[PDB]
Amino acid sequence: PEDFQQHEQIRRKTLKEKAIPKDQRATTPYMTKYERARILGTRALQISMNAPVFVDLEGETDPLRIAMKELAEKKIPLVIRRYLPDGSFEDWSVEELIVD
Amino acid sequence: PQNENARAEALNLANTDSQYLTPTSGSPVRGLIQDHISAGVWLTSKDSF
Amino acid sequence: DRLLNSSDYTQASVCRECGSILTTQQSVPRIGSISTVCCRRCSMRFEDAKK
Amino acid sequence: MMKGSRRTGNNTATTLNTPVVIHATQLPQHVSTDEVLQFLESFIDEKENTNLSSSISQLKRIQRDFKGLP
Amino acid sequence: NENRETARFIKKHKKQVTNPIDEKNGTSNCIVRVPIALYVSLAPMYLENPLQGVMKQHLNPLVMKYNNKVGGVVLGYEGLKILDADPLDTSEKLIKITPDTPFGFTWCHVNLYVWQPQVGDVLEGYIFIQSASHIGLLIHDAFNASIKKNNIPVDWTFVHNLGHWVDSNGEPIDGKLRFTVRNVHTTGRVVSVDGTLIS
Numbered sequence: 001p002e003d004f005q006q007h008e009q010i011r012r013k014t015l016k017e018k019a020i021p022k023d024q025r026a027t028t029p030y031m032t033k034y035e036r037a038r039i040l041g042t043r044a045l046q047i048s049m050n051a052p053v054f055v056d057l058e059g060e061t062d063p064l065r066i067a068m069k070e071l072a073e074k075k076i077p078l079v080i081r082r083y084l085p086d087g088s089f090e091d092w093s094v095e096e097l098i099v100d
Numbered sequence: 101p102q103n104e105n106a107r108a109e110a111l112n113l114a115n116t117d118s119q120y121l122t123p124t125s126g127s128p129v130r131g132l133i134q135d136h137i138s139a140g141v142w143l144t145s146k147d148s149f
Numbered sequence: 150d151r152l153l154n155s156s157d158y159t160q161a162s163v164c165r166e167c168g169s170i171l172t173t174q175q176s177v178p179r180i181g182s183i184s185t186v187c188c189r190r191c192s193m194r195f196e197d198a199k200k
Numbered sequence: 201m202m203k204g205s206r207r208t209g210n211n212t213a214t215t216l217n218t219p220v221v222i223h224a225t226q227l228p229q230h231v232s233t234d235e236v237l238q239f240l241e242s243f244i245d246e247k248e249n250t251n252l253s254s255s256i257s258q259l260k261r262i263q264r265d266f267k268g269l270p
Numbered sequence: 271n272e273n274r275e276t277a278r279f280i281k282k283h284k285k286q287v288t289n290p291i292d293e294k295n296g297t298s299n300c301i302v303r304v305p306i307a308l309y310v311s312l313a314p315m316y317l318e319n320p321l322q323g324v325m326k327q328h329l330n331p332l333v334m335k336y337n338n339k340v341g342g343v344v345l346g347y348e349g350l351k352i353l354d355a356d357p358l359d360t361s362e363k364l365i366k367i368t369p370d371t372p373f374g375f376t377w378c379h380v381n382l383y384v385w386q387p388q389v390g391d392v393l394e395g396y397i398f399i400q401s402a403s404h405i406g407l408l409i410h411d412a413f414n415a416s417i418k419k420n421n422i423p424v425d426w427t428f429v430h431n432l433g434h435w436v437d438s439n440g441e442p443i444d445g446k447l448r449f450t451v452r453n454v455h456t457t458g459r460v461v462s463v464d465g466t467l468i469s
C-alpha cells in the first residue's frame with residue numbers, strides 16, 4: 001500500500017533508464033544466428049501449446065517447420081531484447097531484421 | 101533432446117553442416133576419406149566412357 | 150536440457166524473506182484446513198505474543 | 201502415499217491458478233451503497249453478454265440485497 | 271533492543287483503514303475498494319486475445335474466496351490494466367516470455383472490491399435459524415454469522431419444540447439482528463464468522 005509505492009516507483013524508473021530508443025539504437029541490423037535459434041525455438045514452443053498460427057500450414061506436424069514457415073514471411077510476433085553488458089538494452093522486432 | 105528450444109539448436113547451431121570448417125584456423129573437417137578418393141580418380145580419368 | 154531439464158529438474162519452494170530452500174515446508178493442516186506452505190526461520194512460535 | 205499425493209490438488213496452485221505476487225498498490229478506500237450497487241450493476245452487466253456461473257449468482261444475491269427483499 | 275523490532279510485527283498484521291460507524295444504521299462500513307498488482311502467466315493460446323486470458327485464468331477464480339493478502343473476501347473486480355515491458359496507453363504492448371516455457375508473464379494493475387471484517391465492528395443481518403445455545407445469521411445475502419450462548423445473556427431462555435427464542439420480553443426474535451463481531455476463523459473453505467452481543 002505505501003512501501004510498494006516506494007518499490008514500483010524506483011523499479012520502473014530504473015527500467016525506464018536503460019532503454020535505448022529507435023533513433024539511438026546502433027547495434028547490428030542483422031539476425032545474429034542465435035536470435036534465429038531462440039526465435040525458432042520459442043515460436044515453435046508456443047505453437048505446440050495452441051498459440052495462434054499466422055500462416056497457412058498445409059500438413060505439417062512439427063512445430064519447428066511451422067515456425068520456419070512464419071519466419072519466411074516475417075509473421076513472428078516477438079521482440080528481441082538485446083542486452084548490453086552495462087545493463088542497457090535495445091528492442092528489436094522480427095519484422096525489422098533480415099533473415100540470412 | 102527433449103524440448104523445442106533445443107531441437108532448433110541441434111538443427112541450426114551445433115549441426116554438422118555449419119561445422120564444416122574447424123574454428124581453429126578455418127580448415128575443413130568434413131570430407132570423404134579412403135574409398136571414394138582413390139575411386140574418384142578413375143571416374144574423372146579420361147578413359148571413363 | 151542436459152543439466153537441469155533431464156537430470157534433476159526440481160521445483161522447490163523458496164521463502165522470500167529469509168532466503169532458503171530447505172526450511173520451507175508444506176503445512177500440516179487442521180483437520181478442516183488447507184495445507185499451505187510455511188517456512189521455518191521466519192516462523193516464531195505463538196508464545197512470543199507480548200503487548 | 202494415499203494422503204500425501206492428493207495434496208497437489210488440495211492447493212492446486214500452478215501459475216495458471218494464482219498470480220505470483222499480490223501487492224496492493226494503494227490504500228483501501230470504502231465504497232458506499234450507491235457505489236457498490238452501481239458497481240454491481242455495471243460489472244455484472246459485463247459478465248453476462250464459460251465458467252464463473254456460480255459466483256455470478258452469488259453476487260446477484262448481494263445485488264438483490266441492496267434493491268429488493270429476500 | 272527488542273522494542274523497535276516488535277514494530278516489524280505490530281505494523282505487520284494491523285490493517286490501517288477502519289470500519290467507521292456510518293449513516294447511524296448501527297452497521298459500520300465494510301465494503302472497501304483497493305487496487306492491486308498481480309503477476310500473471312498468460313497462456314500461449316490467449317496471445318491473440320490477451321485481455322481475455324488474464325481475466326479468465328487469474329481473476330474469474332479470484333472472486334468469492336477469502337484472500338490472505340488483502341485480508342478479505344474478494345467481491346468483484348473491473349478494469350484490467352496490462353503494463354508494458356517497453357517503456358515507450360496504446361494497443362500493442364509486449365510481455366516477457368520465460369526462457370524455458372512458452373508462457374510469458376507480465377504485470378497488471380486491476381481494481382478490487384472486498385469485504386472487510388475486523389474486531390470492534392457492529393453489523394446487522396438477517397437470522398436464518400437458531401437454537402438454545404447458538405443463533406446463526408446471514409449478512410448481505412452472502413455472509414454467515416453465528417451468535418452462541420457464550421455471547422448471549424442469562425435471562426434469554428428458549429421456547430422448545432423448531433423451537434423459537436425467548437428474550438427478556440418473551441418473544442421469538444425477528445430476522446434482522448444487530449450484533450458485534452468476534453474473531454473471524456477461516457478454517458473451512460466456507461468463510462466462518464464468529465460474533466458477540468454484549469458491549
Ligand SMILES: [Zn+2]
Pocket residue numbers: 164167168169170172188189190191
Ligand atoms: Zn530460512
